[PDB]
Amino acid sequence: DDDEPPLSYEQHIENIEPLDPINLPLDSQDDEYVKDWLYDSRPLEEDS
């Protein structure tokens, strides 16, 4: 609504557990090497 102030993150948002993203379900053996990290934020941020 136009007259509603933007709701505070710390009260109305942060205490709610998030919901399910897109995440195409991968096969277990045809997609073996990329399955455990394909959908991370930075997929191999710590794998030297």
Partner: protein, 156 residues
């Protein structure tokens, strides 16, 4: 990863023993960020001094568990650093030699100040007191600007 999402990992063993006490700091932080309206300026600094105190005490709790009395596993302590229950850099300053009672990380940053020097809470008390006794007035430093620190020297 302070919010708990799908990317997060489940907790190691000892966390359920120390889950309640950390919970106290959580609810106490949700009194501090709560917008109590104050007209003055010093009374609006008191709120930020309270927040920095609560963050310092939670980090001292996780530090005094893992390093001093060795009461939690290393595998749990890495999780507590990952999930931002602790400040890795402030604990890294606590592990040094001259810095153990350190308030916050803006009181040792030389770049922020006017002329070089750190915050005045880093001075020992007796050195300030002998300079104030030499000039004969009194020691006039009650409480710092950044933290509200009252003498966070290692000897004090």
């Amino acid at each position: 990863p302070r919010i708990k999402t799908r990317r997060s990992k489940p907790a190691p063993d000892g966390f359920e023993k120390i889950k309640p006490t950390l919970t106290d700091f959580e609810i106490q932080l949700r009194d501090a960020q709560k917008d109590k309206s104050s007209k003055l300026a010093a009374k609006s600094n008191e709120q930020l001094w309270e927040i920095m105190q609560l963050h310092h005490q939670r980090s001292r709790y996780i530090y005094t568990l893992y390093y001093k009395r060795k009461a939690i596993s290393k595998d749990l302590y890495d999780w507590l650093i990952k999930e931002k229950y602790a400040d890795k850099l402030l604990i890294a300053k606590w592990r040094k030699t001259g810095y153990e009672k350190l308030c916050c990380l803006r009181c040792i940053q030389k770049n922020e100040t006017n002329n070089g020097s750190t915050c005045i809470c880093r001075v020992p008390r007796a050195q300030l007191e002998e300079e104030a006794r030499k000039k004969g007035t009194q020691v006039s430093f009650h409480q710092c600007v950044h933290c509200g620190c009252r003498g966070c020297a290692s000897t004090d």
